[PDB]
Subunit: 234 residues, 4 copies
């Protein structure tokens, strides 16, 4: 039982409230730069992740209760060539000792090890014909790179996107939405996810992002703000 909440209007660099993995870094301007950028140009074969320093209890084995939570963040994905973007950015939950996995289409969160359980909401900028539908999309993933559900997403180059994710334990309902405030465009996806049967009691959480493996398929994956709130009923 317990709760956790926080809010960061921007990110302060060199402060241990984030666990940076891979190429991830926080700029002097307060931006969480998940993937490498050289002179403004995003680099290929990059992978970066950022986890909140503390994990939270998503369910309790003694009471059997499951936590409900919400998280919101803003992010920007900018690409020199909007026709060739890859690979995506995702918010995810995983074991406390979670470490970066495969590059590219695996978004750094997938690579079946029953110890690498993971639930994620992905903003996929590149269609992987081997497991992706068609075109850019929002996706909800449980233990694999193949989403349990996807919805089309009209990505807008360099535009600030507001994301909201909520999980209602009582209905095991995970909802994810993306809105471009300046453009008044919006997208949403929902799926049933039984976190109690997927994840361990305690989990770390945050962001992961990768750029494409092939030349040209690059984009930035910058998070600008982040708030979170969870509550596990006693």
């Amino acid at each position: 039982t317990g709760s956790l909440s926080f809010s960061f209007p921007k990110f302060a660099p060199n402060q241990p409230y984030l666990i940076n993995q891979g190429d991830a870094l926080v700029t002097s301007t307060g931006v969480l730069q998940l993937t490498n950028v050289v002179n403004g140009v995003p680099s290929s074969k990059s992978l970066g992740r950022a986890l909140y320093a503390a994990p939270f209890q998503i369910w309790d084995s003694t009471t059997g209760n499951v936590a409900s939570f919400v998280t919101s963040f803003t992010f920007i994905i900018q690409a020199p060539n909007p026709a060739t973007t890859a690979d995506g950015l995702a918010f995810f939950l995983a074991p406390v000792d979670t470490q970066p996995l495969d590059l590219g289409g695996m978004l750094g969160i997938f690579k079946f090890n029953k110890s690498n359980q993971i639930v994620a909401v992905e903003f996929d900028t590149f269609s992987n014909g081997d497991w992706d539908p068609k075109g850019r999309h929002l996706g909800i993933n449980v233990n694999s790179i193949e989403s349990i559900k996807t919805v089309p997403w009209n990505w807008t180059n360099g535009e600030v996107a507001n994301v909201f994710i909520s999980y209602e334990a009582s209905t095991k309902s995970l909802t994810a939405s993306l809105v471009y405030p300046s453009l008044e465009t919006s997208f949403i996806i929902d799926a049933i996810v039984d976190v109690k049967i997927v994840l361990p009691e305690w989990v770390r959480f945050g962001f992961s992002a990768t750029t494409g493996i092939d030349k040209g398929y690059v984009q930035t994956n910058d998070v600008l703000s982040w708030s979170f709130e969870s509550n596990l009923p006693g």
Copy 2:
């Protein structure tokens, strides 16, 4: 400056935390029944509204700051004949002394009086060819029954719908989403709304709903739960 938040898993009847208007009532089972139902069958020409007992400050004239808020609720709309549904349910903000207005397509919140300023998110179950696009839809309305924006909505008879509405003051961005947890279907709409130039400093808020005027065009408009949270920066 200030804040307000609350959560009601269900509604207790005969308790002054709600201001009931029109035909609205709270059942012994804890359901907020906005429109009349006779022996399970919704009645026509019904109008009911429910406001939280206390208003909240949405903006401050001294500091010029604007509040950000979020609200979530679950509701059900059941109709004997799914081909003929009317008129809709809405969440709205208005002056503290707000009173029910016109029936039917006006959803009880519209009837131009600069004192009847109102912002609402509507779940419209009937297309009014005079100001509505086509088919059922989600809508964001500012001072008039004609929405500044609408998106198609696939209503599901008697199914529990989860709604989430958020307002980010910094971007004047109002977002509304509806999800059917059991069906994993979801809809969303977003629009720029400048509450500071539309509403007074203090506003009351809640639900309003109406049934059709013509025979047969009926439906229930029942709210099952409601949570709210606002924060006006100092």
Copy 3:
């Protein structure tokens, strides 16, 4: 089950988030003036109370759970003659339809009617030899003007006092503290209070204050800010 929280840095006049009773009023400067003041001088035989517009559920008969809550406020009591002060200011919980009671030493909250159940934390500025110990004191009262416990209080004329009250349901522990930030002085009291056996499921809450009945025994009873938070486990 449910929750409620709010925060008011100051009080806006003519806004229905407060239910004013007796002589209570909100000044143009945002001060909650509980008792009458004429040209700066507090009047005798005055009684004023202020309740939050909405009640909250302090316990649930279905689950049997009890709510925990906290409230904080700042107040000032100024008197022309510091040797003759009366009668006091109190924070209290009572039935939703609660109305002002007796003047003077009864602090407007006492007058045994099993329907007038009340729990209060009092800041008593006048010793009533018939039921009060000796000198000014903090007190916790349950259903009567005679406190279940009192602690000495060194009141400071016109000084801003910060009050914090907390109720831990699990231990039925009610704690009340008063601090004068500028003076670094502090006082505290604690007592076991079984709200489930004292109050009804839903209660309204707020402030009550009275001035003395006899000439000279006067003081202002002004509240400057107020925050509240309750949570009733499901």
Copy 4:
């Protein structure tokens, strides 16, 4: 700018939400055992500390704003010989890289290095004639083992104590209270503390405790629960 809050009804062992230092450990029963205990008997010359995994921003150099926060916890101090208890338990704020300092009377938080800035609320069970008044007491400390203020404390062997600490940035007022719910006894202390001029922008926080250096002067220093909430205005 930002915020952080959490609540732990008890402590789960082997979970990275706490940074354990010195002898500190979490029992299988969920108790945060700060100092060593051998077969129920507390050991001498022990020192243990526990910090929340993430730091929080207590003030911002860009806006100049200061955060307000509150924290509550329950703890027990049990000693074989109640006549000889040492040394104490404290809640403290310090630089993010804070490491345990001196044993015994220094409570593991003191040892003047302008980089070892620290603010703490101490529950001192042993009077150090060299810098302590007389008898057990509550104390507020800023950069040194000599408290800026102390108040007498009647410690009760093995009794659960509820602690509440609040910091109001606007008045630079730090308040600390201790109550024994079962005994209805209470103690409180308050002092002006200018955190902006004492601590760095970001700080880690938590508990520290030590047992006496001399034989016999021992006690347990067990924390049972902990909640925290901070808000740094933008």
